[PDB]
Fold this protein.
Amino acid sequence: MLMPKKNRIAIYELLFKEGVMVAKKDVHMPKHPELADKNVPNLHVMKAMQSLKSRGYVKEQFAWRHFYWYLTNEGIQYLRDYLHLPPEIVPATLRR
Amino acid sequence: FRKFTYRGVDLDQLLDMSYEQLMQLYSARQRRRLSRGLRRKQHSLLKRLRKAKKEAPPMEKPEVVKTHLRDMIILPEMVGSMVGVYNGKTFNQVEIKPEMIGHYLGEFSITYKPV
Amino acid sequence: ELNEFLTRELAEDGYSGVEVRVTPTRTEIIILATRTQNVLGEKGRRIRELTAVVQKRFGFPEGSVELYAEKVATRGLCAIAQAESLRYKLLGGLAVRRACYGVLRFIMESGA
Amino acid sequence: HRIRITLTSRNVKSLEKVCADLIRGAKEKNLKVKGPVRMPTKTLRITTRKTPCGEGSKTWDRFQMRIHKRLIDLHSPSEIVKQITSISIEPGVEVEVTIA
Amino acid sequence: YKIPDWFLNRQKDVKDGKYSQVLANGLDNKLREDLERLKKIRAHRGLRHFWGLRVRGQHTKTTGRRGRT
Amino acid sequence: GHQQLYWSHPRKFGQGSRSCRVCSNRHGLIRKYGLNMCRQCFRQYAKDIGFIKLD
Amino acid sequence: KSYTTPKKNKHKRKKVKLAVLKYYKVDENGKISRLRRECPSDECGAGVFMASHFDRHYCGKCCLTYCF
RNA sequence: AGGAGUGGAGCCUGCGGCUUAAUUUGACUCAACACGGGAAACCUCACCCGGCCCGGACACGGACAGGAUUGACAGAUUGAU
RNA sequence: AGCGUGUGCCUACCCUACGCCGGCAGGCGCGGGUAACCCGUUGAACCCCAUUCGUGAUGGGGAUCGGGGAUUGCAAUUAUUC
Ligand SMILES: [Zn+2]
């Protein structure tokens, strides 16, 4: 499949900012629900998150519709590696 | 032998009248087929069929064309060509007659066999 | 929704039930669970990330809800956590029968 | 001026206790109050086939719920009404304030 | 005779096209020419009338017991 | 245009426009009072909502 | 695996040998000579040029066909 | 003791049988047969015929920004702009 | 008369009265309702009263069978409904 670059760096810059996110079980949808900025899709976000499932960087939760993902430290080091910023910044889940 | 009339009007007159009095010329069930709004949402196949009818053949029957639409209207401008109805297996190679105006295109299909 | 979500997720540390208290501008909620040390994680990271999950899921004003948890008293007298304990005993390597008599003597001298 | 306090809940005994506590507070804070009305309740009826398969005797579920609504009238400013609705909050009771 | 045009039996016929009330021998000729017209044009309703079953779209598991044996 | 041909039948009516909230089923759904759920899971999780069978 | 009807091939891209080298043709100097005419559309100007067939020209993502 | 009846007349509906590329399928005396809430014009839909795309993540290699790779109007093609 | 039902999550599809147009099915303006408020005192049906019919497959039965006219949707032929 084709993965456009802007949406994927968008989901890094949202996933590093807010660590946990939900996604309703919908492939046939024109617009991703809680990201109302651009015409971002949902199936590409699903495929990226199951890629981090296949590497094991993020855990999985699923109840009826809303796929819940939980990142581990491997996802943290992958995010801070592809972000190319020094690690003096922290994700907001660590912030109290 | 008799010059047939579409309930009073000849076929030369049928090709000499247009839609805006044609929908009073035919019945009410397929008036809404032509008058409820714009015909563009699935009518690209209808437009291509109109191109295939208006393209000019030599002095014989025109070239064969098949369609997968069954709920197609018949018009006086549709008279005198070849269409093929989608029956799943076989396109029925049956001509039309100028006295067929009013019915649908899918009026020529057997079900299975004469058991 | 939230009850079956906690049965899917919080079953690792013995979740029992939920009763959410509706109140405007402060939506408090209590969670009934046994192992309280395993619900907060590492100084309250887990509670805040479940709060962020609820905020991103249900479409609420941010920084409004707060999630509580506590140790259950007379823990043998809640049926969900005892079933989860029997599941945890039967999962690893135990025989079914001796686990049944163990949970039976636990509930009988628990006080029921 | 006129305050039309409408109260919605689910249980009858909790509604009666909350209405009694509101009447007691209105008597304690030295202000007039109108009569406690009891609005009639409607059912919640759903009939379903009890068999997930297509097999069984003709057995069904007859679910019913009585949902409770009630109303009362006040003649006071919003300070005392807000304090009463802010104190003694139980989760089965949803208050509603409307000046009408 | 001040009878409204909707208040007729046959409307827009092939012969005249005017709203006319046509009686027993005339309707016999009308039904004969209509059945021969559908038989000649070989429409779906014409073939259904040619086979001789319920042309109005019904189910024939319990009906038609007295037709053929 | 395959992805342009995903959406050729608009889902605003019929049965494909609607689905359950619990099990992705489209047979035997409850539309009354916005339940939006199949009947068997409604029976399973009725008491968790707060429903009691008084009759 | 192998069905009855012969399957066609998907439109894979071959090795276009030094395409950008054929974008401009330099005779002797440091000047720039444009062989293919640049696209006059609003989306792309002097950065994208039109596709060169033998019958009629075509654009890229603009998708305009200019009649002669 | 009775009453209302059914089975017979016409019609809706389900099953068995025939047939069709396909007529999707389970249940067979109480304890299957207006049953799966199953009143389907398309989705439903699970069946056949017709053509597209992957919804092959990832690991080991080949290949590769000197190209590893995508989206199509002029116009022939089925069924479609 | 009583159980009931009603502006919607993704989700648009609701309940209708008043006032005109045509016999009808329907069309345009027009307000109200999150509901003992608007439909709605649900002027419900069956029954009842004053004519019409008279033992005749008959003023029962409406099966079978053509034409015209309406609303729904992307579209009703294998009759969608009236
Ligand atoms: Zn251009």
